[PDB]
């Protein structure tokens, strides 16, 4: 299916990934939405 | 034990002994050897003169003085008058050989200066006239006399050593098999060169294979006294001489 | 992968990689780890870009010719008037390629050619014309056309290519020898004679390539330029050599100007940064 | 007839492409290849061979003078030489390494310099060879030079010193062409002690500079050189 | 498949997902099931459309140049008269693309270019001409053509592309670094000097692309516009950032008008629906 | 020579298409990728981050 | 419709090429070959046959 | 993958080789960078 | 590899043959280069 | 591959490949090894170029 040898010539495959929003939404050290007070 | 600076080279019925030498060079990492049965295209049984030709010959020494530009010899041309080797060049259609080249230049510890010895394959020369002017046979085949880069010649090759008679800077000539004679340490250079060509065997007279150049990168000088003058002696031997196609002596 | 550098700590020893003798002609390999302390690190590199194959494997313009569609004139040969235009093959014509090849003494490769034609009509032409262009390879010893419509163009045995202006032709040509490698330089003559030409021109017998506008004469002159590109394949080379520093003068010669410009730029002092 | 679709780029000519093509000479049998010494596979093999540096490219310096670095008498702490380190330019522009590198946009990996002392066997000297990483100017004084990467060279029995210039870079690749952002810093040499010649001897002695690539030397992207023109 | 929502009934508890502290900088995930009763239901969605790859993977016009077929004039450089037109590569020129890229601090990808040429003849031309267009990539440090027919166009080592007007060229260009990712922003200088230029222009050394009409001069002037499109492949990006709100002024700069128009539209009152 | 048939759309330029294409720089070796914090795979990862609402845009 | 790319040389006429091509005469049955003396496979077979040299071309 | 029979018609494959700089950097007979004196 | 059914449509394959110059160089009844006299 | 020539040394014999009679119409094959001493060497050649097929093809 590939006609060229350089990687650059390949099609824009094509592999999906799971999401990982925690990098941006939960960078906070040692917390969890337990329903527990955020600051205590 | 032994030191790299001390060496003896025996070849045929001749020897060279050195005490102040740099390790010799085998150009491109390969020794001279005979043509194999899968390289050959020549159906004629070849001749191998061995000792009768493969011995050291010495070319008339040249003087190295301040202002000298350096010298150039062509091989096999330089040896064309050298006894049997010489004669064999004219009695055969084609031949093949490597060389051992020794450049000798004695000095004391009060001298300084440095020669660059380079062996350049297929050194196609630029004409002194430039333009589209070719170099005449007579000026590419001086034999033993070599080409003195210090001597003007309006019909000869370009002489300015900055470019090695070909428009290419000397600084980069070290890409070629080369060795220096730094009077500070070694007083001789030794280079072994395998036969190099696109053709298994070739004419010994219409074509040179190697161009040996010796250039005083750093002018000769003494700590004191008048301008020094040191002879430079070049000794060359065929390694594996293989000849073919016997015919009436070529006349040129 | 391989390491570019291997961790090395301060040394105090008798072994001194930093001292040598260039007089030997050796360029013994040394690493940063021989002069300084170093961190271990990977190359992340194969050298693919620097392969000889990739270096000489890019197409380059070799030669440009001009041929025209024009009513033959009784007073001129069909070469004087560009109805037909026979290029003597030589990669040395357009010097960028020349240098890349001259960097080696002996070079062997198969060739790939690409031929592109473009027309123009500087005159009062009332319409364009997608002229058919013929290229014919003429090996040494083969007939050289005398007329734009000569019998030679039959190409009974000569390889030939037909393509239109605006289109291109592409084909491969195997290594043509005759030797085991092409010579970039030749320190010799065709034979043992004082007046014989010196240099690679002696060996350059690749023949010639003839170009023609196939179409019969139109009602106006059309000018066609044909550009020939060359790419080497399966490239091998031997005995590298220093690249030329000075401007080239003529094809097949190493000649240079009698009073050349020094390639090296100067500065006020050796101490100037 | 298989249905097909053409895409953009159809019938383009790309000089860097690689495709199969019809032979113009069917069944041709090439001349057999014989062993030829000096086969080259990679330009990097060549890049590792020492060539001379035209370091003394000063105004009014001619001939081979450019390849001779003068050393003289009773100089102490003085600068012998120095230059801004460029790969495709400066004093290295015309070196083998330089010319090879002029064919490439980017370059990474360590360089080697070496110097051959060609003066009298009875002479002696100690030189400081130093490299100053980017982010500084000069050096103008030995006291500055010594703060960089350096070696002290005992010009004794062995004539040659090798200085490996490390890849002191926060950038994976530098440009071959002059560039402020990726500049490689400076190279300099100072008299560690002084040149000493035999009593009553007064003369200039010289050394030769050489350059080559280190085994870790890398070149990334091919381009045309600026070192040739044509009319 | 996965659930968008999970059935949840009325709660009366001590756990309160609805209360938090944004002061922490966290944006802890909550669902409708935390605020209201809900029915169980499927996503029926993969997010494929929102992948970074699809977002930055659509072709966009990057730059437009104009070159002409015209008889050279002795009094003007071949850049003054558009016989040749060297584009300095920068994806920031046509700002829709710029924003999509600026949304990330560091971006890595291979490029795919598509080049389309269109001719026009505003003059009294008697016929059309499908001119051949050459594009040449000129890496930093490579020779910059001075003439439309200069030696540089030989493209001995420079990648080059030939295509006709009305046709298009397409090719891939691998990530060119030199760093491990392209910088969209650069909070710095080329070096430590008060007067040194500030910003990404410092790092943007992708070279330039030269365009030329290959054809010789016709009997009339032809104007060719060449549009360059870019599409990223195998795209990775790091450190997302807020998209620019204000109009861009100049390439490589984050500058904006001294008295900018507030991007936020206003209303009579906070209470207006 | 395999018989082929061209279809409508031949030689069209579609900005949303995805095809293979020749490399302009054969055997090029890209700079190694190092770990860089904050890698993004989907825009939806970003969409889930709180930002301020200019609510009082009066 | 399989995506394809045309390359330089498309639609060129090369006199030394070798490709398949449609027959103009479908299902034609050629005359049977009978034994004919003197079959030649290579020109080199011929080259080895002695011929006279017009040596006295004075 | 090959469509033609002449070798010349093949693509510019495609086989890398290890480097051997010793031909040009260490042609010198019987030496090694042992840290030992070059000339002794 | 063949796209057509008529033999005529096939490519100019492609099968080499050994040489047999004896048809033209040695048609002579009952001889051999034994170094023996040609006529005796 | 096949040999173009087979090593052959000086001969002194009764067999004489160098003498024949063209009157017979034969062109009996001879080699360089029949006239001169020779080195052994390979053809490195198939004759593909000279095939009738390539000639008239």
Among all residues of chain I, which has the CA nearest to that of G23?
A: I9
Closest C-alpha to D149, from D128, D172, D180: D128
Q: How do beta strands B25-26 and B188-193 pair?
A: parallel
E2-11 burial, b for 16+ CB within 10 Å, e for fewer?
eeeeeebeee
Decide: residue E37, CB within 10 A, 0-12 exposed, 13-18 middle, 19+ buried: exposed
- Third-level CATH fold of B1-252: Jelly Rolls (2.60.120)
What CA–CA distance (Å, rounded) separates I28 from J28?
Answer: 10
Q: How many CB atoms within 10 Å of residue J49? A: 16
User: How far, rounded to the nearest angstrom, does the alpha carbon of residue C133 sit from its chain's CA centroid?
Assistant: 23
Give the start-to-end residue ranges of the domains of chain H: 1-40
Contact across the interface for B172 and D118, Cβ inside 8 Å: no
Distance CA I4, CA I13 (A): 14
List of chain G residues whose C-beta atoms are within 8 Å of the C-beta of residue D7: 3-5
Q: How far is H27 from chain B (nearest CA, A)?
A: 5
Q: How was this structure determined?
A: cryo-EM
CA distances G20 to B43, B99, D20, E126, I4, Å, are: 43, 56, 17, 42, 8
Q: How many residues does chain E have?
A: 273
Q: What is the number of CB-based contacts under 8 A between chain A and chain F?
A: 47
Q: How far apart are CA A36 and CA A34, in angstroms?
A: 5
Smallest Cα–Cα separation from C60: which of C93, C108, C83? C93
State how far the alpha carbon of G56 is from the alpha carbons of G52, G53, J22, in Å: 11, 8, 20
Q: What is the DSSP letter of D47?
A: H
Q: D176 and D37 in contact (C-beta within 8 Å)?
A: no
**How many degrees, rounded to 5, is the angle at CA E95 between CA E91 and CA E96?**
100
Q: Is F36 on the interface with A (CB under 8 A)?
A: no
The radius of gyration of chain I's CA atoms, rounded to the nearest angstrom, is 20
Counts of helices then strands in chain F (DSSP H, E): 1, 2
Question: Measured between alpha carbons, how far is residue A24 from residues A18, B12, E243 in Å?
Answer: 15, 83, 16
Interface partners of chain J (CB pairs < 8 Å, 3 or more) are: B, D, G, I
What are residue D116's DSSP bridge partners? Answer: D160, D208
Whether J and F touch (3+ CB pairs < 8 Å), yes or no:
no
CA H17-C233-D95 angle, 5° bins: 65
Q: Which chains touch G (3 or more CB pairs under 8 A)?
A: C, D, F, I, J
3-state secondary structure of B90: helix
The CATH code that applies to domain E1-273 is 2.60.120.20
Task: Report yes or no: B196 and B29 within 8 Å, Cβ to Cβ.
Answer: no
The single-letter DSSP state of residue C78 is T
DSSP string spanning B118-145? EEEET-PPPBTT-TTPPPPHHHH--GGG
C211 in Cβ contact with C87 (< 8 Å): yes
Distance CA B74, CA C187 (A): 9
Q: Does D141 touch chain E (CB under 8 A)?
A: no
Contact: I23, G46; criterion CB under 8 Å: no
In three-state secondary structure terms, B87 is: helix
Q: Where are the alpha helices (DSSP H) in J1-57?
A: 52-56
Asked if the Cβ–Cβ distance from D116 to B114 is below 8 Å, we say yes
H-state helical runs in chain E:
52-56, 95-102
Name the phi and psi angles at I19, rounded to 5: -85, 150
Nearest-Cα distance to chain D for C3, in Å, is 8
Rounded Cα distance, J55 and D26, in Å: 10
Answer for the pair D54, D67: CB distance below 8 angstroms, yes or no.
yes
Can you tell me the distance from the alpha carbon of B103 to that of B113, in angstroms, rounded to the nearest whole number? 15
Rounded distance, CA D39 to CA D34, Å? Answer: 12
Q: Would you give the DSSP letter of residue E24?
A: G
D25 touches chain H (CB under 8 A): yes
CA distance B233 to B235: 7
∠ Cα C239 C242 C248 (to 5°): 115
* Residue C213 to chain E, least CA–CA distance (Å): 17
Task: Report residue D102 CA to chain centroid gap.
Answer: 11
Please give the Cα distance from B24 to B26 (Å, whole number): 7
Residues of D with CB under 8 A from a CB of B: 32, 34-38, 46, 49-54, 63-64, 67-68, 94-96, 99, 116-123, 157, 159, 197-198, 200-201, 203, 205-206, 208, 210
Per DSSP, what are the bridge partners of residue B232?
B62
Region label for F24, one of left (φ > 0), alpha (ψ between -120 and 50) or beta (otherwise): alpha
Residue positions counted in chain I: 40
Minimal CA separation from I27 to chain J, in Å: 7
Nearest in space to C272 (alpha carbons), one of D140, E126, E12, J50: D140
Nearest CA-CA distance, residue F28 and chain C, Å: 5
In whole angstroms, give the CA distance from residue B11 to residue B25. Answer: 16
User: Taking CB atoms and an 8 Å limit, are G48 and I25 in contact across chains?
Assistant: yes
Task: Compute CA H34 distance to the chain's CA centroid, rounded to the nearest angstrom.
Answer: 23
* Closest-approach residue (CA) in chain I for G16: I12
Percent of chain B that is helix, strand, coil (3-state, to 5): 10, 40, 50
Exposure string (b/e) for B70-99, b if CB count within 10 Å is 16 or more?
Answer: bbbbbbbbbbbebeebbbbbbbbbbbbbbb
> φ, ψ for residue C154 (rounded to 5)?
-60, -25
Asked if F7 and G1 come within 8 Å (Cβ–Cβ), the reply is yes
Quote the CA–CA distance of H37 and C15 in Å, as a whole number: 9
Domains of chain D, start order: 1-231 (2.60.120.20)
Which residues, in sequence order, are bridge partners of residue C3?
C42
E268: Cα separation from own chain's centroid: 38
Q: What angle do CA D209, D214, D218 make, to 5 degrees?
A: 120
Minimum distance, in Å, between the CA of residue H9 and any CA atom of chain C:
6
- CA dihedral of B74, B78, B84, B88, whole degrees rounded to 10: 40
The DSSP secondary structure of E92-159, one letter per residue, reads TSSHHHHHHHHTEEEEEEEEEEEEEEEEE--S--SS----EEEEEEE-TTSPPPSSTT-GGGG-SSS-
> Do C108 and C235 meet the contact criterion of CB atoms below 8 Å apart?
yes
The vertex-E255 CA angle with E252 and E261, nearest 5°, equals 135
Q: Judge: C256–B137 Cβ closer than 8 Å, yes or no.
A: no
Return the CA Rg of chain C: 26
Q: Do chains I and B touch, with touching meaning 3 or more CB–CB pairs less than 8 Å apart?
A: no
CB E177 within 8 A of CB E154: no
Report CB contact under 8 Å: J30, I33. Answer: yes
Residue pair B61/B229 in contact (Cβ under 8 Å)? The answer is no
I11 touches chain J (CB under 8 A): no
Query: How many angstroms from the chain centroid is the CA of residue B98?
Result: 11
Q: Which of B217, B226, B182 is CA-nearest to residue B70?
A: B217
Hey, how many other C-beta atoms are within 10 angstroms of the C-beta on A21?
A: 18
Give the sign of the dihedral formed by CA B172, CA B175, CA B178, CA B183. positive
Chains with ≥3 CB–CB distances under 8 Å to A:
E, F
């Amino acid at each position: 299916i590939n006609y060229y040898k350089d990687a650059a010539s390949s099609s824009s495959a094509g592999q999906s990934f799971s999401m990982d929003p925690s990098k941006f939404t939960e960078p906070v050290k040692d917390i969890m939405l337990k329903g527990a007070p955020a600051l205590n | 034990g032994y030191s790299d600076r001390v060496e003896q080279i025996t070849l045929g019925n001749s020897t060279i002994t050195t005490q102040e030498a740099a390790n010799s060079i085998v150009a491109y990492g390969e020794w001279p050897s005979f043509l194999s049965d899968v390289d050959a295209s020549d159906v004629n049984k070849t001749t191998k003169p061995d000792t009768s030709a493969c011995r050291f010959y010495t070319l008339d020494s040249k003087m190295w003085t301040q202002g000298s530009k350096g010298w150039c010899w062509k091989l096999p041309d330089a040896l064309k008058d050298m006894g049997i080797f010489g004669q064999n060049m004219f009695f055969h259609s084609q031949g093949r050989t490597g060389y051992t080249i020794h450049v000798q230049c004695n000095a004391t510890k009060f001298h300084s200066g440095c020669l660059l010895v380079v062996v350049i394959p297929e050194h196609q020369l630029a004409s002194a006239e430039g333009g589209n002017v070719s170099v005449l046979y007579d000026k590419t085949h001086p034999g033993e006399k070599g080409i003195d880069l210090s001597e003007a010649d309006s019909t000869g090759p370009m002489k300015d050593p900055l470019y090695m008679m070909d428009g290419t800077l000397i600084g980069n000539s070290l890409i070629f098999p080369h060795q220096f004679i730094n009077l500070r340490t070694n007083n001789t250079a030794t280079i072994v060169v395998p036969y190099i060509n696109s053709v298994p065997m070739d004419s010994m007279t219409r074509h040179n294979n190697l161009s040996l150049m010796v250039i005083p990168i750093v002018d000769i000088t003494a700590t004191s006294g008048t301008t020094p003058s040191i002879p430079v002696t070049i000794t060359i031997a065929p390694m594996f001489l293989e000849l073919s196609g016997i015919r009436s002596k070529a006349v040129i | 992968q391989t390491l570019a550098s291997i961790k090395s700590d301060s040394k105090h020893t008798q072994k001194v990689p930093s001292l040598t003798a260039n007089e030997t002609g050796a360029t013994l390999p040394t690493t940063p780890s021989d002069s300084v302390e170093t961190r271990t690190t990977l190359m992340h590199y194969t050298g693919s870009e620097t392969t000889l194959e990739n270096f000489l494997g890019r197409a380059a313009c070799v030669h440009v010719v001009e041929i025209v569609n024009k009513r033959p004139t009784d007073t001129e040969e069909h070469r004087m008037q560009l109805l037909f235009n026979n290029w003597k093959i030589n990669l040395s014509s357009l010097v960028q390629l020349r240098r890349k090849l001259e960097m080696f003494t002996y070079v062997r490769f198969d060739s790939e050619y690409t031929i592109i034609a473009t027309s123009s009509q500087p005159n009062e032409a009332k319409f364009s014309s997608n002229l058919t262009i013929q290229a014919m390879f003429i090996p040494p010893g083969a007939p050289n056309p005398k007329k734009w419509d000569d019998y030679t163009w039959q190409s009974a045995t000569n390889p030939s290519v037909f393509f239109n202006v605006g289109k291109s032709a592409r084909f491969s040509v195997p290594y043509l020898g005759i030797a085991s490698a092409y010579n970039c330089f030749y320190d010799g003559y065709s034979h043992d004679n004082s007046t014989t030409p010196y240099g690679i021109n002696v060996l350059n017998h690749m023949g010639s390539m003839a170009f023609r506008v196939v179409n019969e004469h139109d009602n106006h002159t059309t000018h066609v330029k044909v550009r020939v590109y060359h790419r080497a394949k399966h490239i091998r080379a031997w005995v590298p050599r220093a690249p030329r520093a000075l401007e080239y003068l003529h094809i097949g010669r190493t000649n240079y100007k009698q009073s050349p410009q020094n390639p090296i730029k100067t500065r006020k002092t050796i101490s100037t940064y | 007839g298989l249905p097909t679709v053409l895409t953009p780029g159809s019938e383009q000519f790309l000089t860097t492409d690689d495709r199969q093509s019809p032979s113009a000479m069917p069944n041709y049998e090439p001349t057999p290849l014989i062993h030829i010494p000096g086969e080259v596979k990679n330009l990097l093999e060549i890049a590792q061979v020492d060539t001379l540096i035209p370091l003394n490219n000063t105004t009014n310096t001619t001939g081979l003078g450019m390849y001779r670095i003068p050393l003289v008498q009773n100089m102490q702490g003085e600068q012998v030489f120095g230059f801004r380190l460029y790969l495709g330019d400066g004093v290295l522009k015309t070196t083998l390494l330089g010319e090879l590198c002029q064919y490439f946009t980017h370059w990474a990996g360590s360089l080697r310099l070496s110097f051959m002392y060609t003066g009298p066997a009875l002479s002696s000297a100690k030189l400081l060879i130093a490299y100053t990483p980017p982010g500084a100017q000069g050096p103008t004084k030995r006291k500055e030079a010594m703060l960089g990467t350096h070696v002290v060279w005992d010009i004794g029995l062995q004539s040659t010193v090798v200085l490996n210039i490390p890849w002191t870079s926060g950038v994976q690749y530098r440009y071959t062409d002059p560039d402020t952002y990726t500049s490689a810093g400076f190279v300099s040499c100072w008299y560690q002690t002084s040149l000493v010649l035999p009593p009553q001897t007064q003369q200039t002695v010289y050394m030769l500079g050489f350059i080559s690539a280190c085994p870790d030397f890398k070149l990334r992207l091919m381009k045309d050189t600026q070192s040739i023109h044509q009319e």
